[PDB]
Design a binder for this molecule. Structure first.
Ligand code: NDP
Ligand code: SF4
Ligand code: SF4
Ligand code: SF4
Lengths: 208, 311, 80, 176, 114, 156
């Protein structure tokens, strides 16, 4: 209770509750979910056709300034009809606030390239292109950053394995570096670390 | 056979091949490319060196983790050669210096070396001994070099009779001896009519590794000749045309000039490249590879500027 | 010298100059797509090879709709 | 609370402007910088003299990956694999067999000194304190083969000193 | 299931784009093999270029063909720049064998495998 | 035996001369580079041993590969390493470089820098101490005491 347990707040909780209902009231075209965790950081869950309207509204409108940006990593999730999650993380300057904009997408449908409204978004967008492969229509510059040039395969997906397919070594047969299929000297013994006996009772989805 | 000699998986970078090699020499050229293809093939390579450890550091990163191993040896003992072939699947004899020192002649290298190692190898119970030699070894005169290699072939077919004697013709490669001798002509050239047929080094060592992994190789000596068979003066025209250095035709022993002005003949008494089943590559593209040194920024980049016929 | 025979001779010797042509067999209705066994890949190879030899801008739709060497002759005749 | 910088202005008094001019001419505080450096020049230097005067350490330092044993006793490890289960780069290869009595042991206990990262997590996880970080850090190996320790290498490494490790743990067991 | 497009509305503009990229890669190869100081004839390079185009012959979805065109145009950006190296362009070649067979018999002697 | 005697004296001269200066260059990828900078810290001097920084690849003797060698780096590493004179030496400094280490099971990471260059001296520790790195350089100097190159050349 008082020791060892982080005391939850109520002021920011009720305020972000009211603010989420405010945003849901004022943009009914592009609101699907508003949600608040116990530690009170706002999440707004979004169809990817009003990304530029929500961002132009959130940087402006003077009821919420939201100048500052943090990354949008589209965390790779199978089993959904639309796979990936673009995660904006907006951090205001006049309010000390944190909202998240989770819009969803899938493997081929482009989203509308938030570089034109946040200049910070450019290298983050090139990063998510090079690592996942969500193509960004209406964008000035799409190179590949934080990989090899000749490499492809978008390695942060769940389909790409832990060690890569290609492997570089040197040979004096052509006096240069060449690529080879992968050969590991030790198996990387995966560990089964998933306990039974219902680790959390509150988070049971309704069973089939 | 003992276990962990059996093959395992896709070859390359710690796939245990069926061979454990013992390579004589290997500090210089041909043995280095042979160790290179064995480390790609993924074997365990015992190599002796009688020299400074820098060349053995040079061929260190070729094999995988701990697949190669080093020792010391000489042409004067028997314990070191016996300790080399204590545990050897296959063993190859590459040795031979192009010039005589003040201690080791062209005599007694091809007499003292292959007799000793052949005798202790046959007494050590190895398989598939492969000794290299040159083409056109004659018992007759005009080459101390080639007659000593002829006596070497005689000794290695004499003792351990199901060996494999392999002769190529002259070989050209990424660090060739003879075209890098044609480097030194640029500061000074001799032209006579003589046919010649070089062969590129990596298909030579491809044929060597196929013949060392494949039995039927014992007994029958083999001859490795490229598809070229052309004239000396066309080679000199070709190399100074690829180098784009202007020319007016007219570390060296006279045995060198006797080698390059002897002859190059053929022998249909024995099979060769494609009869063993390995591809032969022509001269020209490997010449564009190996002539990058001499150009110096005038015509440094060129490919198809010159073609020279065979015969 | 820009008559019909100049254009036809120049297209003739540069399709001679092409290497993988199967067989030689040039005609005014040769139709190297479906009579000589050539893909759309080799179609656009040949068209921009003409463009490399002496050509114009040769826009990709007008480059794309030629298909036959005598029509290439008439095309350069229309454009040059 | 904040304290911002360069709220300053050139004062327009004559002594002020002529002192700024004299500093413009002679580079006077440049000479003050020279004087500060000479004040560290005549200061006595502080190095050590490596083969003879080694640098200091700490009692909790992380070294060797050696092994202990009981007072005149068995190998203290009991093959419980907690060290591999915390080993972050999986550099602990353990294959176990019981010995010829019924008591349980190992066969193969290999530490990859390359792939190790010297956490101390295998110090914190070993239930009997059988694997211990050593004090000394001098491996310095001319081959790649000879940084892969087998079991008998580890136990001959742990028998090169114990009174060392006993002293460090005895002075350090209450803390952790 | 009307997916938003990439560039086109059917496959005809996709065919136009991929043939335009093949035009660009045709005219850009001898510049690179003259520039990186390699050891390969030009016709070998052009033929492996068209082989790498023919590797993807079965592709039919228009978004996917557009995305291959975007990949190829990004690599031609990286080869009109000299941002890549000799190693990558030789890595497109498959010259250090890798002579791995296709017969059943050789895959049986060198086995544990189909 | 005056010939081998004089050649032995001269070989001892040049090997002493080689182990004398040994200035490296600074490749220095990650936090092992910070340990190199603390090997340039005044509490553990390298200039007691004539060991100087030299950022050009054209006059260093040894070269310290120190950091996590990736695929985007490794051809540039060897294309630095080769254009360097004939006595060349490699210090693999750190768990990342001496066998892959903590990023061993990943894409884009060279599993041990024997796959690019040869290695004379491994110095493990993540990071090494300044003391351990200095011990490795002293052992490399003792390797240069163990050369007998010119004796080999004469007795050939
Ligand atoms: N066309 C042909 O068939 C020809 C074939 N060859 C063969 O090609 C191979 C490569 O050629 P090349 O580079 O010139 O030769 P090598 O590099 O193989 O030279 C012989 C090797 O054995 C060592 N060696 C030589 N003489 C002695 C000796 N007296 N005592 C002890 N060790 C000795 C040398 O040591 P180190 O260098 O370390 O001092 C060297 O490593 C050789 O096997 C050669 O015979 C050569 C010419 C023509
Ligand atoms: S944690 Fe200790 S007792 Fe357990 S297996 Fe590892 S070394 Fe042995
Ligand atoms: S200190 Fe080394 S061996 Fe021990 S758990 Fe960490 S990485 Fe593994
Ligand atoms: S070995 Fe350790 S200290 Fe060195 S680069 Fe890797 S993580 Fe950093």
């Amino acid at each position: 209770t008082r020791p060892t347990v982080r005391p939850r707040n109520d002021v920011a909780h009720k305020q972000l509750s009211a603010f989420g209902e405010y945003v849901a009231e004022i943009l009914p075209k592009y609101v699907q979910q508003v949600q608040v965790s116990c530690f009170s950081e706002l999440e707004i869950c979004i169809h990817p056709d009003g990304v530029i309207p929500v961002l132009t509204f959130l940087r402006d409108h003077s009821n919420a300034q939201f100048k500052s940006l943090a990354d949008l990593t589209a965390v790779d999730i199978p089993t959904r009809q639309n796979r990936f999650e673009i995660v904006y993380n907006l951090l205001s300057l006049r309010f000390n606030s944190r909202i998240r904009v989770k819009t969803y997408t899938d493997e081929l449908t482009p989203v509308e390239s938030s570089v034109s409204v946040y200049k910070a978004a450019n290298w983050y967008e090139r990063e998510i292109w090079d690592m996942f492969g969500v193509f960004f229509a209406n964008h000035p510059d799409l190179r590949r950053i934080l990989t090899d040039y000749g490499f492809e395969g978008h390695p942060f997906r769940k389909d790409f394995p832990l060690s890569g397919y290609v492997e570089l070594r040197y040979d004096d047969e052509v006096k240069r570096v060449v690529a080879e299929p992968v050969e590991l000297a030790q198996e990387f013994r995966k560990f089964d670390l998933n306990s039974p006996w219902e680790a959390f009772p509150a988070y049971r989805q309704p069973p089939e | 056979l003992h276990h962990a000699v059996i093959p395992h998986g896709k070859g390359g970078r710690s796939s245990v091949s069926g061979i454990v090699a013992t390579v004589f020499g290997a500090t210089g050229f041909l043995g280095r490319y042979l160790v290179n293809h064995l480390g790609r093939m993924g074997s365990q390579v015992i190599v002796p060196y009688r020299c400074e450890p820098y060349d053995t550091m040079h061929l260190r990163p070729m094999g995988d983790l701990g697949q190669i191993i080093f020792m010391d040896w000489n042409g004067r003992d028997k314990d070191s050669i016996r300790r080399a072939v204590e545990h050897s699947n296959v063993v190859i004899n590459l040795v031979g210096r192009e010039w005589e020192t003040k201690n080791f002649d062209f005599e007694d290298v091809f007499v003292k070396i292959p007799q000793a190692i052949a005798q202790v190898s046959k007494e050590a119970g190895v398989e598939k001994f492969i000794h290299i030699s040159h083409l056109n070894a004659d018992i007759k005169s005009s080459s101390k070099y080639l007659r000593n290699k002829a006596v070497g072939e005689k000794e290695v077919r004499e003792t351990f009779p199901e060996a494999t004697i392999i002769k190529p013709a002259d070989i050209f490669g990424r660090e060739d001896r003879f075209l890098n001798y044609f480097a030194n002509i640029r500061w000074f050239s001799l032209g006579k009519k003589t046919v010649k047929q070089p062969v590129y080094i990596v298909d030579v060592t491809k044929g060597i590794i196929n013949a060392i992994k494949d039995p039927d190789a014992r007994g029958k000596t083999f001859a490795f000749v490229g598809p070229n068979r052309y004239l000396l003066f066309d080679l000199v025209q070709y190399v100074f045309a690829v180098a784009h250095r202007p020319f007016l035709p007219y570390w060296t022993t006279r045995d060198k000039v006797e080698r390059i002005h002897t002859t190059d003949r053929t022998l249909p008494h024995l099979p060769g490249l494609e009869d063993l089943g390995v591809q032969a590559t022509p001269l020209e593209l490997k010449a564009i590879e190996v002539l990058r040194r001499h150009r110096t920024y005038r015509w440094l980049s060129s490919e198809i500027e010159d073609v020279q016929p065979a015969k | 010298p820009l008559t019909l025979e100049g254009i036809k001779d120049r297209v003739l010797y540069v399709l001679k100059l092409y290497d993988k042509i199967d067989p030689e067999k040039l005609s005014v209705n040769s139709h190297f797509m479906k009579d000589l066994g050539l893909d759309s890949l080799d179609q656009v190879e040949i068209i921009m090879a003409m463009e490399d030899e002496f050509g114009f801008e040769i826009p990709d739709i007008d480059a794309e709709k030629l298909m036959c060497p005598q029509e290439i002759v008439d095309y350069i005749a229309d454009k040059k | 609370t904040y304290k911002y910088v360069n709220l300053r202005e050139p004062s327009m008094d004559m002594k002020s402007v002529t002192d700024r001019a004299a500093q413009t001419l002679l580079w006077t505080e440049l000479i003050r910088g020279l004087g500060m450096t000479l004040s560290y020049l005549f200061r006595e230097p502080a190095t050590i003299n490596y083969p003879f005067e080694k640098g200091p350490l700490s009692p909790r330092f992380r070294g060797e990956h050696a092994l202990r044993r009981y007072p005149s006793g068995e190998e203290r490890c009991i093959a419980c694999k907690l060290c591999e289960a915390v080993c972050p780069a999986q550099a602990i290869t353990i294959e176990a067999e019981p010995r010829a009595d019924g008591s349980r042991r190992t066969t193969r206990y290999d530490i990859d000194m390359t792939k190790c990262i010297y956490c101390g997590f295998c110090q914190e996880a070993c239930p009997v304190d059988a694997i211990v970080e050593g004090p000394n850090f001098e491996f310095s190996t001319e081959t790649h083969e000879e940084l892969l320790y087998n079991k008998e290498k580890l136990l001959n490494n742990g028998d090169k000193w114990e009174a060392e490790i006993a002293a460090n743990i005895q002075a350090d067991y209450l803390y952790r | 299931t009307s997916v938003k497009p990439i560039f086109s509305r059917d496959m005809n503009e996709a065919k136009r784009r991929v043939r335009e990229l093949y035009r660009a890669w045709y005219r850009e190869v001898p510049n690179t093999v003259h520039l990186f100081q390699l050891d390969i004839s030009v016709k070998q390079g052009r033929d492996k270029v068209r082989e790498m185009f023919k590797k993807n012959a079965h592709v039919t979805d228009p978004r996917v063909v557009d995305l291959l065109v975007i990949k190829g145009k990004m690599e031609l950006e990286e080869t009109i720049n000299v941002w890549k190296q000799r190693t990558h362009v030789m890595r497109f070649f498959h010259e250090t064998e890798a002579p791995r067979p296709k017969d059943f018999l050789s895959k049986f002697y060198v086995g544990h495998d189909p | 035996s005056r010939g081998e005697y004089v050649v032995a004296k001269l070989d001892d001269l040049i090997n002493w001369a080689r182990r004398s200066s040994l200035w490296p260059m600074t490749f220095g990828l990650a936090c092992c580079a910070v340990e190199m900078m603390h090997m340039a810290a005044p509490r553990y001097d390298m200039d007691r041993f004539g060991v100087v920084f030299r950022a050009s690849p054209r006059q260093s003797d040894v070269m310290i590969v120190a950091g996590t060698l990736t695929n985007k780096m490794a051809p540039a590493l060897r294309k630095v390493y080769d254009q360097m004179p004939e006595p060349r030496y490699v210090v693999s400094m750190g768990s990342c470089a001496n066998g892959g280490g903590y990023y061993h099971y990943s894409y884009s990471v060279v599993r041990g820098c024997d796959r690019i260059v040869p290695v004379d001296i491994y110095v493990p520790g993540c990071p090494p101490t300044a003391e351990a790195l200095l011990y490795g350089i002293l052992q490399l100097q003792k390797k240069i005491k163990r050369e007998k190159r010119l004796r080999i050349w004469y007795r050939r």
